[PDB]
Amino acid sequence: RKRSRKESYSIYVYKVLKQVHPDTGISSKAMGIMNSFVNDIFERIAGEASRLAHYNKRSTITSREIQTAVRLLLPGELAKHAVSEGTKAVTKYTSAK
Amino acid sequence: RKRSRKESYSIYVYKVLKQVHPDTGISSKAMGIMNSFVNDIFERIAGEASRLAHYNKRSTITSREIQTAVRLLLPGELAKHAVSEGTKAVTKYTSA
Amino acid sequence: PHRYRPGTVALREIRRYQKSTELLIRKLPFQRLVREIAQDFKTDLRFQSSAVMALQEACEAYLVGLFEDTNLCAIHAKRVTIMPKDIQLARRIRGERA
Amino acid sequence: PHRYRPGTVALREIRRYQKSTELLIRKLPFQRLVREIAQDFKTDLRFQSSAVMALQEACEAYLVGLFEDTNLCAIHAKRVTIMPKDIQLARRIRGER
Amino acid sequence: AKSRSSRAGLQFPVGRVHRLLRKGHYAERVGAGAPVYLAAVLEYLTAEILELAGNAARDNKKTRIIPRHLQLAIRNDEELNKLLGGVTIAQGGVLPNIQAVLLPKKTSATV
Amino acid sequence: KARAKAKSRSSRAGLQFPVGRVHRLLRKGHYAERVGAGAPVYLAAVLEYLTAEILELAGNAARDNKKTRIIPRHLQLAIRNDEELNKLLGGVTIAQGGVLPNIQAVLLPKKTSA
Amino acid sequence: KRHRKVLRDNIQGITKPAIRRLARRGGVKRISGLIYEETRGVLKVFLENVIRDAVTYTEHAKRKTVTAMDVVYALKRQGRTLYGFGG
Amino acid sequence: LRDNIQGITKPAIRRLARRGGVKRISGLIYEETRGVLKVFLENVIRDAVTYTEHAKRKTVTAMDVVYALKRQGRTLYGFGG
DNA sequence: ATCACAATCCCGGTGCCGAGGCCGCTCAATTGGTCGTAGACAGCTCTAGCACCGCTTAAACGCACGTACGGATTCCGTACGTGCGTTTAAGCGGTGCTAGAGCTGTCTACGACCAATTGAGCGGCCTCGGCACCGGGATTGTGAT
DNA sequence: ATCACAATCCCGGTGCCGAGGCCGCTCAATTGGTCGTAGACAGCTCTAGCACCGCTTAAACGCACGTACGGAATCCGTACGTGCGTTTAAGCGGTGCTAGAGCTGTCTACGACCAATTGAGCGGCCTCGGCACCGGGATTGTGAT
Ligand SMILES: [Cl-]
Ligand SMILES: [Cl-]
Ligand SMILES: [K+]
Ligand SMILES: [K+]
Ligand SMILES: [Mn+2]
Ligand SMILES: [Mn+2]
Ligand SMILES: [Mn+2]
Ligand SMILES: [Mn+2]
Ligand SMILES: [Mn+2]
Ligand SMILES: [Mn+2]
Ligand SMILES: [Mn+2]
Ligand SMILES: [Mn+2]
Ligand SMILES: [Mn+2]
Ligand SMILES: [Mn+2]
Ligand SMILES: [Mn+2]
Ligand SMILES: [Mn+2]
Ligand SMILES: [Mn+2]
Ligand SMILES: [Mn+2]
Ligand SMILES: [Mn+2]
Ligand SMILES: [Mn+2]
Ligand SMILES: [Mn+2]
Ligand SMILES: [Mn+2]
Ligand SMILES: [Mn+2]
Ligand SMILES: [Mn+2]
Ligand SMILES: [Mn+2]
Ligand SMILES: [Mn+2]
Ligand SMILES: [Mn+2]
Ligand SMILES: [Mn+2]
Ligand SMILES: [Mn+2]
Ligand SMILES: [Mn+2]
Ligand SMILES: [Mn+2]
Ligand SMILES: [Mn+2]
Ligand SMILES: [Mn+2]
Ligand SMILES: [Mn+2]
Ligand SMILES: [Mn+2]
Ligand SMILES: [Mn+2]
Ligand SMILES: [Mn+2]
């Protein structure tokens, strides 16, 4: 027989799981929910980022559109922590040219 | 002098107003509401057509994505009439 | 004989069902209702088994949620008994109903 | 001499305000609240006057709608008088909390 | 028929809609038929509300449609009220509507 | 002039989530004509942060339920007991989640015993 | 082509106890006898609405098989986003 | 900018109630209504100001408010967009 | 309070199947390089946002007074919850059939990209008719009697 | 019933200014040509949806019975609507100041696109440890007394 390659975020969700709870697993259904969750928030932030660019007559989605999209979409503390992780990752990456 | 170009559906709203109520006019604010409406429904129909093409791995939005978008977005009779006017307008354009 | 006072078994049932996550409508009846309704829209539709399970998970969560709002409408009226007028108010305020 | 019975004027006021479209909050106290609230998120902000008018249109239409739902919660309890518990139930069911 | 609108039998601007569809981050490609169907749909919905709105104007002895007429037209039409259920019409007000239990008792007997 | 020891954009960013993947999904998504280099890094970092947050609370729910594996019920308990995750996912149904134990006070039986 | 039997009155397979169970999960202690037919009616409207959108996606894709994804996309349209079937 | 919430007067709230079909109003509604209004305005203005900052402006536009209301499921017609 | 007794809770034993690890092949992310253009930036204009003040007056305010509403109480009838024995059909595990999902390879109609052309639609300017606002004085609606 | 009297209606008058038309300049739509690949279309494999069937049970069902519920009916106290005189400040308008929005032009850093490259992540394949299920004791609450 053959295959049919379907991408999911499963390996990254496992890696992150291993970091926070090193002796915990996850059922395929729970992983299904985490995959739903990642796809959902992705679409929300990119969607909002698209509009932000369009509203401001800009051709390009930058980290700054992502940042503004995050403050609009996430509540309170979640937004603060999300922006720090975002800012830290972009600062680190731009040094690692 | 000369303000920056600000596009609107105003001339087309008036042309349709005159087909329907030739003796009727329209306030500036009412024309603002009608513009908001066209922009709103444009956004909703184009948005659905976008998702529809993507769910089906298509790079192109055809009148077929617009029709399905319209069936998902419009209630019952509005949809029947909207599909009819849309199909009629493609047909008559494909011929001429 | 032994006889529970009315409300005691109802309260046990709330504790048991709020503790579990299992689908509460029997599956075969749910699947025939899905096929009858779908048929009336288009004939000769098949269903992935998982499509019927997605509809059953969505329908059950919608109704569990509605019954919460409905309960709050009953209690608002100083009742303990949900009535169709409570469902109608919750649906009206939800924007599901005119 | 003579006086209208309680509720007779209130009916008349409903008929009057449901016939009309005019904004029912004095514009200048509304404008001060908007500015006061804005300052907590960003100091030395200006507003297009049409920006404050958009906010006033949106707030009064929301509150009118909330008052319709509140009224139905009051009548549901066999009352003719709206109370805070009525606003709270309408907002809980609207999913505003 | 130089203009796509005239070719389509439309008042609304097919060329403009085609441009907005292309510039609008909806797909890599837009078929020729798409902006005809969409323009047509937009005209039809515009006609439908301007028809009910014009009626409201005449009913209120006015020559000119104002926002109130648009609000009366939309909220009194089942399908339009459902389409625009999430929308506030600036300066629209609301439909006259008093709950039966709020009305006085009709004097109720004689005189 | 040897070029490569392959270095993931994820490793450059200090992330487990795939910067490569996320960039490609942003270029294929018809979101804008162009996507900057930082966009996918920031976005991948926000998706990682929120994942960590749900898995932290879900792991704890599993451990409370005497289980080593996270099930959807654990994700629902985590999400619905957290004010901000609950708001973020207020319009989302978790299949096989069930609900929080919650009985309105008035429904509880009258004062008994001592 | 055998043709499956005719489907009639299947709304009644949403039984009084199944509806009690749902109400219990929803925190309900006491249930008027008219609740069962009102619930059936509310459920029918919800199912018709989601199935209508889902079959519209199925038609658009030129299939005769309603996928989980057509239901998931139909739920999302209706503001009833469902996780766990290909979200 | 001290206590501008009380600028929303008992009578102004009573007018809004009237347009919403309300015949009789408890004395506690006025403070309840003020709380609800502040929460509504805080939520819409936070988002509007956020669009302002992203546009690197210092002036809140109608359009900022219209995008804010759209995000909150409170779409407003008559102010552009 | 002080019981018997249901129903739930908790425990370790049982055995089963899906979580999770390996493995090897492949598609997609990476490296490196070229080319053109979006937007950051710097400069300049004049819009419209803001401050401030005086007058006019309608709206807000607060206080008196009394009605009709909400809430507490008592009651009575039967709609519901509980539990019994009987009835019903879901669930399960099984085989048996093929429809249609979904993948590949082919290959041209169709939509992107482009240059050159011109008329549809935009802002500027102007005015006059629709409608807001008024008060004359008419009939209706509310409440006192 | 009668009888204010405030509200409501409709009327023609009147004076304001924005709807809507005319003009003429311009940029975005159209025309006609190129060129590349998206997707129709046909063919092929085989996953998974559907259908039939016979048990075994647990769930669904109808019915007896009663009690706690909901709703009807009454009474009492004051919250809240109405109307007044008094105070407040919104709205108006007109003047006077400058922030900064919104536009321009310049130049280059940055992201699209292309080729060559290789290992991250895929499905296939396998297994054994987590947990669903069980039966059997302890423990917890309810209802009787
Ligand atoms: Cl097309
Ligand atoms: Cl960037
Ligand atoms: K300005
Ligand atoms: K199949
Ligand atoms: Mn940890
Ligand atoms: Mn155990
Ligand atoms: Mn296996
Ligand atoms: Mn696996
Ligand atoms: Mn390997
Ligand atoms: Mn690689
Ligand atoms: Mn490079
Ligand atoms: Mn530029
Ligand atoms: Mn009463
Ligand atoms: Mn089977
Ligand atoms: Mn076949
Ligand atoms: Mn096929
Ligand atoms: Mn062509
Ligand atoms: Mn013009
Ligand atoms: Mn007069
Ligand atoms: Mn008259
Ligand atoms: Mn007149
Ligand atoms: Mn004009
Ligand atoms: Mn001309
Ligand atoms: Mn042209
Ligand atoms: Mn292809
Ligand atoms: Mn029997
Ligand atoms: Mn009672
Ligand atoms: Mn004035
Ligand atoms: Mn002024
Ligand atoms: Mn300056
Ligand atoms: Mn500037
Ligand atoms: Mn630069
Ligand atoms: Mn794998
Ligand atoms: Mn193993
Ligand atoms: Mn073992
Ligand atoms: Mn098992
Ligand atoms: Mn057991």
Residue numbers in the entry:
A (entry chain H): 26 to 122
B (entry chain D): 26 to 121
C (entry chain A): 38 to 135
D (entry chain E): 38 to 134
E (entry chain C): 14 to 124
F (entry chain G): 9 to 122
G (entry chain B): 16 to 102
H (entry chain F): 22 to 102
Reproduce text from the manuscript describing this model:
DSB recognition by and activation of PARP1 is proceeded by actual phosphorylation of H2A.X13, which ultimately culminates in γH2A.X foci formation to induce a cascade repair response. Here, we produced γH2A.X using a hybrid chemical approach and assembled nucleosomes with either H2A, H2A.X, γH2A.X or mutants of H2A or H2A.X as the incorporated H2A variant. Nucleosome stability/dynamics investigations and crystallographic structure characterization were carried out in combination with surface plasmon resonance (SPR)- and bio-layer interferometry (BLI)-based techniques to measure the kinetics of PARP1 association with and dissociation from the DSB constructs (represented by the blunt-end DNA termini; Homo sapiens histone and PARP proteins). Additionally, enzymatic assays were performed to shed light on the catalytic parameters of PARylation. This reveals that PARP1 recognition of and activation by DSBs is modulated by histone variant composition and post-translational modification status.
